[PDB]
Design a protein around this ligand. Sequence first.
Ligand SMILES: CCC[C@H](O)[C@H](NC[C@@H]1Cc2cccc(c2)CCCCc2cc(cc(N(CCC)S(C)(=O)=O)c2)C(=O)N1)C(=O)NCC(C)C
Length: 367
Amino acid sequence: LAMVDNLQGDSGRGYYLEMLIGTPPQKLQILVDTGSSNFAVAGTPHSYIDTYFDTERSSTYRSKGFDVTVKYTQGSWTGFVGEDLVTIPKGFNTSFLVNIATIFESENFFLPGIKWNGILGLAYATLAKPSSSLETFFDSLVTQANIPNVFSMQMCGAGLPGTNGGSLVLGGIEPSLYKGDIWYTPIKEEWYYQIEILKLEIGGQSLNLDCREYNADKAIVDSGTTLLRLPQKVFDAVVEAVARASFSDGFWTGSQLACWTNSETPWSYFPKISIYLRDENSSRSFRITILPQLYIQPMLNYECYRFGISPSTNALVIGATVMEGFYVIFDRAQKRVGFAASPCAEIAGAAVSEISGPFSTASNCVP
Ligand SMILES: CCC[C@H](O)[C@H](NC[C@@H]1Cc2cccc(c2)CCCCc2cc(cc(N(CCC)S(C)(=O)=O)c2)C(=O)N1)C(=O)NCC(C)C
């Protein structure tokens, strides 16, 4: 469809989509975020962003009468909850009527180097603010364009933070954006896009951790989270395993980069990490494997990288760094998350991620 390469960005600061808003249309760039389910834009100005949304100059704007605050793991913001007409040049050409928040105060939400100026929440209504009545952007498109309740991403920016992008397909799958077969894990709770992680295998070496700690609170697919966050002590074990292949110092914690003359690639010094996820039938499972290329992030005859895994307190987040390796399908209608190899996820024309299945299975791992 026309929806291919409608995204643009990297894993460092995010992937965004060009949207037209209001009457007449204001050209905004909207971060795509499967970790939240609120659609919001910058209603007043700010320094890292270069364009904002002017509600005065949109006659099709209407205010709903209340403000709302949204707090994320990174930053927060408060905005008027209006609604307005939105048009996505790529794929639709039609105007849609959607709730929208215009942000008039943001704390640590607009970071340096962002090229976007709003956020689009593609998660379930459960996470909407101030409640579940605010109808998500994507829920409106389903109900208004009688498209299927399905979207699918492809992020090809597996290089280094001009930035090549990817595709956001609304209404289903674009089969030129993957190769091979698709493995579907079910959605364990239709709030975040929570899935059931069965195992972690660090370079052939299963983790000693209990299966239950991987889904300690939730294990989610979050296009808004840059990295692969892990529950703290899961991270620790993971860190030791990777370290053992070579505790509590700067690179792992991200306060230092490691730099190599451009010729040497450190990736072979690291191990492939495998996430084993449950297939749609209990008995089976499968694994998505990101190689060192994805988690050793490069941020010219030398290159300077960072360890691309950070520790979380409650949740395990499959951020965009893990999602860049694959084509991700968010099938909300059959409550599943689909994974497949992504052709554009190929540095030097070699595969940077792999997907393999099936496998034999604890009884339940979600507490
Ligand atoms: C799982 C719970 C929610 C999930 O976290 C979800 N993640 C998506 C958010 C969205 C967001 C907001 C502001 C700025 C960004 C994006 C920029 C992306 C790049 C930096 C980044 C972002 C997040 C998160 C990180 N990282 C964690 C550090 C705080 S990191 C460095 O990649 O590991 C970096 C993050 O939380 N993005 C969330 O935060 N909140 C959802 C509720 C409000 C509904």
